[PDB]
Assembly symmetry: C2
Homo-oligomer: 290 residues x 2
């Protein structure tokens, strides 16, 4: 349903309120740069500290500004199944084209509990759903067998798989045989995944290098393996630096430096440590982004 470079948008903030002005500008930037879809209120968008109202404001802002020029995916995870259904229902009603649903965090449901969670959400809300597995943050790993069961629920169209593990990508494809799209959720390994059966990448780097990310994905879609890997190597110093502290700390600093946003983070997230500024400015300059 989606492909290519899908940006996990930061949520611009100004004096601890959502910076609608800059968020709208980012939608126009991505449309101009040829990003293939937008994710609103994902992890890179500080979903973990935004209130329910703010998540909805961010989703609505992006959808309204896009004016059907580029698809919009809404992050709608909540730990309780009943809460996730309500948030996913409002994102659907706002016009989101799909819901990206991270697993519950911290509470560590069983595989059974994950199946019940997503199957209840999909039965309750008539919107395409992209599963999102990121055990390195949630302490919950969705196993490939669970993935294959959920692929039989027809509104479950995709999985953003952030583990960076090639054997994980290959076990899901082996078990599902096309019955679910896999999107990389790890910029550092995205090109290998796009060349090995993944449909796209839900990307942090695309916030900063949108054109190059779109190009890299387009070359992979054109089976230009050498071309794709060429651009991946060009990005790799930027990919590494964007996780030097927890995302979205580095990306906000880079976008700050580029003049795209104020670069504010809501506590307990903090602006990028001064020790990394030098290395990241150097990368941004080389890539001609500043």
């Amino acid at each position: 349903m989606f492909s290519g470079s899908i940006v996990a948008l930061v949520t611009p903030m100004r004096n601890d309120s959502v910076d609608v002005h800059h968020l709208r500008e980012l939608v126009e930037f991505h449309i101009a740069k040829g990003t293939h879809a937008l994710v609103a209120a994902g992890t890179t968008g500080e979903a973990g500290t935004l209130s329910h109202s703010e998540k909805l404001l961010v989703i609505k802002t992006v959808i309204e500004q896009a004016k059907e020029r580029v698809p919009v995916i809404a992050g709608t995870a909540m730990n309780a199944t009943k809460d996730c259904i309500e948030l996913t229902q409002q994102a659907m009603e706002y016009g989101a084209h799909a819901a990206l649903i991270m697993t519950p965090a911290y509470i560590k449901p069983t595989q059974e509990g994950l199946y019940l969670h997503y199957s209840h959400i999909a039965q309750s809300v008539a919107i395409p759903i992209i599963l999102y597995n990121v055990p390195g943050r949630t302490a919950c790993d969705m196993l490939p067998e669970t993935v294959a069961r959920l692929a039989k629920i027809s509104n479950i169209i995709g999985i953003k798989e952030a583990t960076g593990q090639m054997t994980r990508l290959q076990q899901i494809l082996r078990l599902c045989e096309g019955s679910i799209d896999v999107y990389s959720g790890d910029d550092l390994t995205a090109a290998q995944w796009l060349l090995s059966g993944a449909k796209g990448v839900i990307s942090v780097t695309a916030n900063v290098a949108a054109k190059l990310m779109a190009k890299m994905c387009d070359l992979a879609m054109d089976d230009d393996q050498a071309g794709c890997l060429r651009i991946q190597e060009q990005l790799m110093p930027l990919h590494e630096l964007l996780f030097v502290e927890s995302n979205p700390i580095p990306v906000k600093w880079a976008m700050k430096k580029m003049g795209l946003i104020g670069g504010e983070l809501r506590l307990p997230m903090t602006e990028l440590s001064e020790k990394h500024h030098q290395a990241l400015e150097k990368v941004l300059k080389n890539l001609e982004l500043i």
Copy 2:
């Protein structure tokens, strides 16, 4: 400020709402069995899937029923520092004796961001605070160096350190030299911790074996290593089974078997798989709890 066996209370549920009747019975049960303090709305209380309203109802219920006969600690973690300040303030206003504050989950702040988080909470709300570190759930490990800085903020009284790693208890004690109390957050290693400088255990097993946990802790406090270890070895088969699926799935099953609660869990948490029932029932019988 606290010591001994401190129960992380389950939150009894009925019809997907807080079961205030059985929650009040549990408060009387602990007073009768001699539990040393009660934690309301912690991880064992399903804090991760309770709404804000529900958390305050559990905390208020516990405080009111206790009638100052036993101290009450309120779980008040939120990811965003400003929201944690609001919940912690409310708990303080309701009369909680301290607030148990887990780190942010899933967003993975830096250690500076954890110091800002807890220093701002402590600054803003005049209540004792017990830090709570559980990186196996939250993907955030608060390091001993950071704990030693926070111990210099005088309303930070304690840390519930849930790693179960003896070198971690040792390093806090070494860096802090008594400037902060350490509470075990891991029943499986709690006796060795109590015998090695920890002040108490914030316990899951105490929900089910409240009299034995209290005597195990009393014996540790009396410097009776053999008597303490003897009870810990009697409880060890129960400790093990209580984590066979994510807490509080097994403990709520055991409490159901004991007639103390209905044993309902909010999705995506699921009642204990049948394959564990026989082993856990045999243990409860073996301990004369059933």
